[PDB]
Amino acid sequence: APAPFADFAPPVRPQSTLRRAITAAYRRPETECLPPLVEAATQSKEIRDAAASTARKLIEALRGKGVEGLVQEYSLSSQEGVALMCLAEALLRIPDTATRDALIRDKIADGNWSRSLFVNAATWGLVVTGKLTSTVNDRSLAAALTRLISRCGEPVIRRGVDMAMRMMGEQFVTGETIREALKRSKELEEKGFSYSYDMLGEAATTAADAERYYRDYESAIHAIGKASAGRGIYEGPGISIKLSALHPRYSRAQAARVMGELLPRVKALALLAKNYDIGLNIDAEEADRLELSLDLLEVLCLDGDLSGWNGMGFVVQAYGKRCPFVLDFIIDLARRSGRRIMVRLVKGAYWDAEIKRAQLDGLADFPVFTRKIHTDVSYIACAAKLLAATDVVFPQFATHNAQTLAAIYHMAGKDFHVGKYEFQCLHGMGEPLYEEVVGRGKLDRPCRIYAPVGTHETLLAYLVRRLLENGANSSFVHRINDPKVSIDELIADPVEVVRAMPVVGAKHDRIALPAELFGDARTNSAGLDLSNEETLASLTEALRESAAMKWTALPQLATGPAAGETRTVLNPGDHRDVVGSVTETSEEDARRAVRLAADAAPDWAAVPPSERAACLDRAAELMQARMPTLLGLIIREAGKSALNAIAEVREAIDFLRYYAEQTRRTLGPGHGPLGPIVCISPWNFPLAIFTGQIAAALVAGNPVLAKPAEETPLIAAEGVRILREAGIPASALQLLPGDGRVGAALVAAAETAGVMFTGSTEVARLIQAQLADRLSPAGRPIPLIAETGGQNAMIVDSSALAEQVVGDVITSAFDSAGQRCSALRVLCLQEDVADRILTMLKGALHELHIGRTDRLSVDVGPVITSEAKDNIEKHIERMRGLGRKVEQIGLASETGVGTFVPPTIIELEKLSDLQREVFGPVLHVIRYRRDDLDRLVDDVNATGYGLTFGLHTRLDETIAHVTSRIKAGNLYINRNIIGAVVGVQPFGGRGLSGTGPKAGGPLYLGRLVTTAPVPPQHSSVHTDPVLLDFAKWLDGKGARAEAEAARNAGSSSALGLDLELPGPVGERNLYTLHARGRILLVPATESGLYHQLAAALATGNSVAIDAASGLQASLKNLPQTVGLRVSWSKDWAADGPFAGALVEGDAERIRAVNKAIAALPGPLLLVQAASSGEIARNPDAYCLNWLVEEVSASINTAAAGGNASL
Amino acid sequence: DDLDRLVDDVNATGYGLTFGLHTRLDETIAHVTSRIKAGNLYINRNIIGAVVGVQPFGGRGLSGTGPKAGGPLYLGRLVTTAPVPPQHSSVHTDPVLLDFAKWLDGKGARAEAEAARNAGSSSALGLDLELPGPVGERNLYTLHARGRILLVPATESGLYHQLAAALA
Amino acid sequence: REAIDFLRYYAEQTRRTLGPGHGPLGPIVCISPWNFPLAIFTGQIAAALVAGNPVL
């Protein structure tokens, strides 16, 4: 048996001093990065004066010289221009130019114009307006297209087709094929330009895609080398490649596959480039790939088979904090290898994405600068370093910024020869600038044009966004065309502007560090960067040390540890790996624990809320400090990967801090505790959900009996140890390890005042049935918060981006071996794109690494137990036996020592083929016709579940349709459907998925006290109109007090609350309160009924009223608006599902009704009960908090390949 | 406490042209503007002097037929085939229209089901625009349901199309 | 002012929307009141005219 974590993440090679200097700078504070850059970029006054003059002359030339003229000629609105260009693009998809012309003339121009015409309207919107949107208003565009065609007819359509042709075939790309691009390059090559060709391609998701990009590159190298015809690496053309195009798993976590599989591919291409003596440049991609790419560069430059060739090139991004240290490494590598490495200095293309990623991952700082002027100084500083090393490297200064250009032109001085350095620019953007540079009549410096090649609609869209800087106001390309921006502004020297600032290198004031995402409310949890070699080295040691510890879990009662039966805890991924020992709780001691909690309840309720919250905050600090050790335990006890364990510890920290802050915002002495709360937690989030339930109950003033899942007691014991260390008294937090019999004893105990349960719907139903026999001392039902299964779907239409879909599906379905309650279970693919997406999904499936999770390279770990494995596999085999197509990855023999299920894709005929939640790595796929979208949504709702739901579409009309009809608590647009963030996507659903309130949301604590507080921002100015009609009807009937109570309910309701929650950039996180549905009303008196009806109507609900109440004659002559919401039910089980219940009666009647409600099939109903007297005395007898439904929606607004606002 | 009945009394005249509300309270604004049935609403200002293309002018009931003068639907009433007005669209689809279309598909009425879905998309119900105007004022223009439409069909398919149009 | 604005607004709406398939009704009778004897007079007439209809 391999020692745990002995091979967790060994580096490709021992890290040299130069490599460690790079890693040290990864997230260095911006105020520390800039001063040495300012120093290195400093030039003499005479040079600065000369550069400003040259920059002014270039900009004057640039300003002294398509779609805009088309918009002018036909008086098009912006939307008409966008719509016209979408039409033109589609018409160009028709090959036969004659068949197209007759379509325009005889069909389109008249009045009759598988995929929306407007799938790429975001791209054209950027072309037309300079602004990027994530999604497109396809109804607006359709209206605009109809309007413009009916107004201007065939002429405007032909003009649009001509314009789209000129842009898509001549301005965005140098050619559609490498042969065409090479032919079109002769003109500027005669004028002194050179070329670097980019076969559009990146981010391979499958082996097949990586192989396709490989043969694209190989064929392009042959064509470029044939055309170069011996011109060599400086005067002749070269190629640019992206490493992510050549392997579907290009990441540090997969470094072994990268070195073993990607490296030989790059070597083979470079050998071909060597034979033709052309340049081969490695483009720079995301920040977490920088240092990995250096390992490939080093191996390539030291490989003797490539000797004799100086065409290897490498991009370095000056917006990156490591840039100068990367350059030091490359210059030294050039000296060691004797190869004159071609170094392309760029600013960088992924800025918006890097900001969002660092925020999502909770890392210390950004790996890029946050002020644009800092990147400019960085670039000039790095240019000075390169210009000092032209003997050993070939600098290539890629920029369209005339100030940057002029600074470097003058920095380089008067001595020039071809091969010393060059400038570079992008095709169809840089030529106007660089035609003022190239040639003896200008500045006589060469420029290499980066020349995109292809027709790839997706990659074409990616490029147009890169070419237009995602529509950024800070970009030179935008500012050069901005008449409000003077030339003096454009030639401002960034070095001296930065030097003059109060704090040199201060972070952008409007971008939050990841720790500061929530401002003054609370401190964001911190993650770990698994691409950082220093982090990986330190984590390896911490993880090894965690595995040497003798972890234990014992019954921890208020009186001390208790004795019991002890057994070992085994690693689910390798049962030979003993993780620790658990001593399990006797039923008698479980009962004793509840009595001890009851005895201690007044003492804990007496601790002021802010001090209870301080315990949670202290526990959060402890968990953060202990994160590496906690990771190791979670990895081995629960079978989780490192990344998932980090996210879990982060979530536990976030729960602690969020409930602490919510307590500080809300709780006072009048919000009395329930009493002892039984917290029953699952094995799949054995720290986060465990901690969240307990922290909420504790901070609300209740003592807790914590019953962890039998599979994962050790991390629970560690969580309790930390909470107790943080100041939670032992009498307030007791740990009761064991199986469901321990849970059952706790639930049944007479002093149990509330139960928080996360687990299966079936166990939740058993708990509900036991609780229904009891009442609180105040004669109310015992509160149950139950978060249960999901049958979570994602709907993908033909406008979605397949590569994005595939990544989000693989992650949502198979992360944590599908053992997330939020996991994607049913993928619904529009028929027109189903086959292409399914092919990619199957290819991506086979790139997953399944195994014991103490290796960074493992993507998917084991399932928790042999019983789990057996249950999942029985489902797969039943599906397979029914003739459904089943795709599975083959598992390695090493998995035989643990309990693994291979990630599996099952193609279903109908959603009804799936009858129950299968809690494992099993994705079901169905196809749908576009016109059946609404029925599909009905079918998704018909499962009875409602937890998570995903939608991938670019079309606003589809977003509005689907999100208005789906009934789920957590919606995700154009992103994965997992990993809900506390206070950002408050988490919890409806129906079979649970009772609410949402964990990590603002209604949670209020369920854990006897008088609910007003949550922060919890109000609505909306009044339900049927409530208002009902209140008028009451007044008409003479029920004056009830009418007043109804109006008051209408005002007090928070129905219609519509909030945006603070979160990361590039995402919009919305939180809304809706009606729950149909509420079961069980009144005893006429006035009781009227109060119940007002409560339900004020929160937007319809009702079913118990016909056995005999109160039918109390609702005579209802307004139709109210009557439409009222039904009468004799057989409650026949008239559901309900979404809640209101009950009136004395204690015996409440108990009898509560038991009858627990027997209703389907969802667990949140039941509220009150006596007739309580209804008369207490305006809040029924709490409106529990009569609305919380919905969280998270929209990825970077999904159109850019962040507009940022 | 009689505010809602007062709004009913105002609506009960059968007219619905201009209406003013003076209040500092958002809940009263939301309440009253959601219940009054008048074509031109004014909040914390006078109720006269509608500005062309800023307060498109005209009401409902006994106040007239529409479309609003000085608004984007006006010219379409004066031609035999109405054009698509500027900015005239909505991403909202009426859910009962959608339920009707599914029912039509269930009955095998595939042509009417497609017609119903197309009406659902073509409807501008839910349009919610801010019109350009002076500073210190917000001028909003919205498209709502009209109410109950009288359907006088002759054939089953005609009824399905009329119902789709009204539901959409 | 209102008469001026009707004229310019219906002119702009025409430029934004009307094409050959938006055929006129024919003669439109425009009946106007004494309380806005220029503005409502002009508004009704301008709209009818610019939509391509002759006006009484």
Ligand SMILES: Cc1cc2nc3c(=O)[nH]c(=O)nc-3n(C[C@H](O)[C@H](O)[C@H](O)COP(=O)(O)OP(=O)(O)OC[C@H]3O[C@@H](n4cnc5c(N)ncnc54)[C@H](O)[C@@H]3O)c2cc1C
């Ligand atoms: C020939 C060529 C090849 C290129 N190859 C690559 C490559 O392999 N990898 C890659 O990542 N990029 C590459 N780029 C660069 C990228 O695609 C953009 O073209 C480049 O960053 C624009 O810089 P500029 O000097 O033209 O314009 P500018 O307007 O001067 O600079 C804009 C740049 O500033 C940076 N920036 C913007 N806002 C901020 C901010 N708030 N804080 C900090 N920085 C900010 C960004 O890097 C942005 O692109 C290449 C560019 C060219 C011309």
Ligand SMILES: NC(=O)c1ccc[n+]([C@@H]2O[C@H](COP(=O)([O-])OP(=O)(O)OC[C@H]3O[C@@H](n4cnc5c(N)ncnc54)[C@H](O)[C@@H]3O)[C@@H](O)[C@H]2O)c1
């Ligand atoms: N909605 C959510 O937020 C959420 C989150 C995580 C997991 N889940 C659900 O959790 C389920 C998987 O977790 P699980 O396997 O641990 O669920 P589960 O029902 O198997 O186990 C949960 C807990 O209930 C206990 N238990 C079992 N029988 C009991 C009984 N008769 N009385 C009292 N307690 C009893 C177990 O000991 C365990 O601690 C899935 O259905 C999943 O969807 C939901």
Ligand SMILES: COc1ccc(CO)cc1
């Ligand atoms: C727009 O020019 C670019 C060239 C290369 C890259 C590498 O990702 C990005 C942009």
